[model samples]
Target: NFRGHALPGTFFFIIGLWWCTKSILKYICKKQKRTCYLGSKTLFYRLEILEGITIVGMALTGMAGEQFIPGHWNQLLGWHHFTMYFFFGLLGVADILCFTISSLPVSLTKLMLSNALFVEAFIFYNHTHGREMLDIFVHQLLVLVVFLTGLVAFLEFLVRNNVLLELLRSSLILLQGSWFFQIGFVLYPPSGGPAWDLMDHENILFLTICFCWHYAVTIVIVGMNYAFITWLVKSRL
Candidate 1:
């Protein structure tokens, strides 16, 4: 009954999304030959440290029972969830400050952030027991999304001639968030869902079909966001 996975999973997911947004905004200002400083290196560093440490702490606490600290595994779950709430709450506040000091759109900024909260809620509200395969599979996709998002952001910031990388990062984050919802609706049946358990071969085949649908949706979302950002930058120029 403890859907702790999605909570902290989404906690880090939004961090990834914000990282993508921050990178894209930098690329946008770079294209215009302008600087995009948030006006306080200290504040930026503080948020970074807080976000970084919290993620590490959550992972340790969450994985304590299965991997590291088998003795206090029971206690670790509450601690992990506590860390999630603390991390995400503070993250929203930090994001508010970061975007306010920069020239970013509030709605778009909050939209991605909102995507994080929605992911957490989707699992929390529609939790199921004894559905390990579907849960693990959807979660694996999330891991890939997070890794790819961060990798693209790193390239966008550090590599030369990486003009398209920031766009790639944003698209990845958008797709990740959307896919979380798709997984929630497809597997979790409490909310009038299809109730597809992956143990059945028919359900497995249907799950493959769902992936195709999600990929199509991802393409549309990525296209719209990329077009919007391009227009926002070019119109200013």
Candidate 2:
């Protein structure tokens, strides 16, 4: 039995979850012929949308917590919680439907959902609590982990069935386009500036770099995905 003091932050839980997931997923990859896609409707698109909405929700709720204006947190959390969770529940329902139908691609679903969590964890760390070095290192590690996991699973699936990773890469670009637009809307609104002003040049630069890379690493991720998808899969079915 373990001692009783709670961990200071989420680090312990994150690591434990990662290791367990890694073990279980390895077993699953060995056992199942992971489906690539259901026609052209892949889980990647759905996961991206889910991720976008999740991040928006987290931001809104976090803002509600940190709000400085009188009655701000109270006012925001009132509606934000309701709106954010409704869509979260919607995704949950769709996910259940996908499973019950058995028409959606499981591998594609894992790839998309995992990748979103991977990327968002990085994005959030860089934007907020992490130290600069810690931020860079952790996000970089996440990118590596995402690539390795996705590539290995993709290979296993393609070995049994012919699926092109290039399409996935292309899909990534499309999804990223949507994310980029959201970043723009959040950081710099079309008409009235951001919901709140950011006053410091340093903070502005930091966020700007984050916004810019939401477009840039995209290129790297897409290209890598295409290469892996195309080179590994042998037969077309």
Candidate 3:
């Protein structure tokens, strides 16, 4: 609905909706044996191609949307909106592949895939936030979060008693995704107020500090999530 909030909103909606459907479907089909892949090898290759092409195309269109040449800003925003729908479309395809191509339980497969996703997110943050010192600092701090998250998720596969590592890793990805929405809410037009929206020197400095504070806050949040997960897992165990 809020087109200005298209990118992150679409991502959030897709993830939430899919999570619900998958969780329910998996529960329903829990008794049936399921293979990781569907159809044939050729189908996997086709999905792989679709994922790659869509990602590259999304990036190219996004770059064009960011063009500062003498053109209509509204047109640029329109192109950006259209391209982002495709961006989220790729995400839908990619997410489905991650789902069906996994031999593990859906939950474990999702955690593993999230590990891979955070690695990509880390690289994206690095590239997207380069040049500007505030952006560099903010995203670099996020790099730590992504790194730790991937580390724990990777370790989850390697270790025993995985609930702990799984929660840690999942929590980290949640934090990173939350930050994307935070970025959108604070920076995007419409809902985003005039506070620190502009890229002025003063705003940059404030945003750096603000983002830093969120690091500490996110750490606290991770701790809280850990506590909650510990109790939750223990209760079930």
Candidate 4:
């Protein structure tokens, strides 16, 4: 279960960091009245297509791991995870299509990405039905971040090319990924540590504090990255 949480946690962390960097670079270019090419190319190939394929591949791997891994099999829970990955895989498909087909509206691509997050949020909202108090609290906080990310994605669709929206999206995703790691540690602590008290109010309160810390740290990380990128671009260009 720690591996399960960790796998997606790493995925989101890397993806979120990449997007944040891309968004900051894009913002800098726009501010300087210059063009930006965030995606690299190799002859006729666009690297973004590779990004799409990687997302789909990762989602499939996660789904397979959930369903077939020995001692980690739970039919209902696997199905829940499958549904979540399915939508994300769909978003990857959309990404590929958008890149390959010039006629596809960019808004539709944004919508697909937002829809994936919405599906994730929906699943997590229902996932806490029989979970413990601490578990529910952590997941519910995750649900909030997921839903906000989805909402911001929707807004990006509605209002295109807004750097702040894109930055917010990236930060929420970073928050989501880090919180996933937090969830893993809280619910399934690593070796040599006692398990969390799922029913303890103090534990729940501490989790709330931890969540706030994650938020503050996420903001600082994003800000620092943005500042660094801005300096790099201004000095270089």
What's model 4's overall lDDT? 0.84
lDDT of 3 by residue, 58-86 (tens): 54554454444524445443444344444
Residue 185 local lDDT, model 2: 52
Better of 1 and 4 by TM-score: 4
Model 2: residues >4 Å from true position, as ranges?
Answer: 1-79, 98-198, 234-237
Runs off by more than 4 Å, candidate 1: 1-28, 33-75, 78-131, 153-161, 190-194, 232-237
Candidates 1 and 2 compared: the better one by lDDT is: 1
lDDT tens readout by residue for model 4, 25-68:
65654565433433223412454687888899998888888888
| Model 1 accuracy (lDDT, Cα) | 0.54
What does candidate 2's lDDT look like per residue over 124-207, in tens digits? Answer: 344434335433443344344335444644454455433233334333433334343443454446666446344455655665
Models, CA RMSD each: 9.9, 14.9, 9.6, 3.3
Report lDDT per candidate: 0.54, 0.41, 0.50, 0.84
Better of 2 and 4 by TM-score: 4
Rank the models by TM-score, top first. Answer: 4, 1, 3, 2
Clashes of each: 0, 0, 0, 0
Checking candidate 4 for backbone clashes, the offending pairs are none
Q: lDDT of model 4 at residue 141?
A: 91
Best by lDDT: 4
Clashing pairs in 1: none
